[PDB]
Write a protein that binds this ligand. Structure first.
Ligand code: NA
Length: 461
């Protein structure tokens, strides 16, 4: 991804966009009961904690574009992946406005809490003033589509979240690019059925894990994986995507019956954005921050891995590449051992910056013991080995519980963390609950004991 130009929005006919400057994150009732070192990300250039230019730090995510055209390896990758997707018999019909808006089987309704983007954010018009969950009214939406049309500017927001001390100082906050409600709705109409098909088929055929339930899906993953696992992390995946990867995606869509709407992909690839009093044009880079791009990022990841394998190991048998992606996150496998370090090298030529899986300093062998997917390890249940626990370390959970975005959601926030934590075992889980119950707010919460969560887990299969 590369910013082509940036200039005052008024110069190209746009209003200044107001974006909150204060974090809604504040110490929770457990701030001093659990250990943690993360704080809210810098949201403005005038943050006392900064140590380097802010604006420069947040837009530096666009490292540039290493490639423009789709080479021969990418074409092969495209034919193999498209071929796989073909077996799912995906309904290529456009989805009706109602379902695209309020959801259907395999597609959750449009999120009402997220920004409605341009121009609604400059009209003080909220989604709640357009969508009726209970009415499933499409008249107001339809009127807005006819009025403002599509291909509108995306609104940039700095993501309000916890970040490491170093990242706070270096202004490394994550920029979020929100599509207009009109575009988001239009895209869910064009690809709604593709999305549902992916949500209902998490695994190695879609090569996707979006929409999955870790508590249940972790038991299915090992059976689909090959003999030898391999993985790695990406540095700024979304922003690093070159235009060619978007072209490769269009080819996959064409081959599976959606060549009808590959233009929407151009809208993601070559896009313009609004940030405060500025507007800028980006070549490449997947608009980051929201679920609308999850599937396309996963699809592109399937193309990337295949491409690097073809480029690095001529004669590789892609039919035996078993991988599952969730955006940039990935867990892959092959009957034979591969060199991640080497793949990383080939990746550089394609504009991808790949590093050792889970912040290792060197590329080590990935095993069922050290592999993580969505930050969760895999652990067989001591009583029933065939049931696999998704284990997220307590560290991140402790970091999260030390802050709150709304006292009204303390119950849900903490219950959420409990669903993640009990998998670390009864000993660890009880220590967690006891610490929670060492302060008034915690004792007033209705939280499930270990026994209850274990039984509920077995009863969910
Ligand atoms: Na873009």
């Amino acid at each position: 991804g590369e910013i082509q130009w940036m200039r005052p929005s008024k110069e190209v006919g746009y209003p200044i966009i107001n974006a909150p400057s204060k974090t809604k994150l504040e110490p929770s009732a457990f701030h001093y009961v659990f250990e943690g070192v993360k704080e809210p990300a810098v949201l403005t250039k005038n943050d006392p904690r900064l140590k380097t230019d802010f604006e420069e730090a947040i837009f530096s995510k666009y490292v540039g574009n290493k490639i423009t055209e789709v080479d021969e390896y990418m074409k092969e990758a495209v034919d193999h992946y498209a071929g796989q997707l073909m077996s799912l018999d995906i309904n290529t019909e456009q989805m009706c406005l109602e379902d695209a808006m309020y959801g259907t089987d395999g597609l959750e309704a449009l999120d009402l809490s997220t920004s409605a983007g341009y121009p609604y954010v400059a009209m003080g018009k909220k989604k709640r003033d357009i969508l009726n969950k209970q009415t499933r009214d499409t008249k107001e939406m339809q009127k807005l589509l006819d009025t403002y049309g599509i291909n509108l500017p995306l609104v940039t927001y700095v993501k309000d979240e916890l970040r490491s001390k170093t990242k706070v100082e270096q202004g490394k906050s994550r920029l979020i690019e929100a599509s207009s409600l009109n575009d988001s709705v239009a895209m869910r109409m064009a690809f709604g059925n593709l999305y549902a098909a992916f949500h209902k088929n998490p695994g190695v055929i879609t090569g996707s894990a979006v929409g999955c339930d870790p508590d249940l899906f972790w038991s299915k993953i090992p059976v689909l994986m090959e003999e030898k696992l391999f993985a790695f992390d990406y540095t700024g995946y979304d922003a690093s995507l070159s235009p060619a990867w978007f072209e490769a995606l269009k080819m996959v869509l064409e081959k599976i019956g959606f060549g009808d709407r590959v233009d929407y992909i151009d809208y993601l690839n070559h896009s313009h954005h609004l940030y405060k009093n500025k507007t800028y044009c980006v070549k490449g880079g997947m608009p980051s921050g929201f679920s609308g791009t999850s599937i396309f990022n996963s699809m592109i990841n399937n193309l990337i891995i295949r491409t690097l394998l073809l480029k690095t190991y001529k004669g590789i048998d892609l039919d035996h590449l078993k991988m599952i992606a969730y955006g940039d996150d990935v867990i892959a496998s092959y009957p034979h051992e591969v060199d991640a370090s080497l793949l990383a090298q080939s990746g550089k030529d394609y504009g991808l910056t790949m590093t050792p899986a889970d912040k290792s300093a060197t590329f080590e062998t990935v095993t069922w013991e050290n592999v993580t997917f969505l930050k969760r390890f895999f652990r067989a249940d001591e009583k029933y080995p065939f049931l696999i626990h998704p284990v997220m370390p307590m560290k991140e959970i402790h970091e999260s519980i030390r802050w709150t975005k709304d006292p009204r959601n303390t119950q849900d926030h903490v219950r959420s963390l409990c669903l993640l934590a009990w998998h670390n075992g009864e000993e660890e889980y009880n220590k967690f609950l006891a610490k929670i119950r060492s302060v008034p707010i915690g004792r007033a919460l209705d939280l499930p004991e270990y026994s209850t969560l274990y039984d509920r887990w077995l009863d969910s299969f």
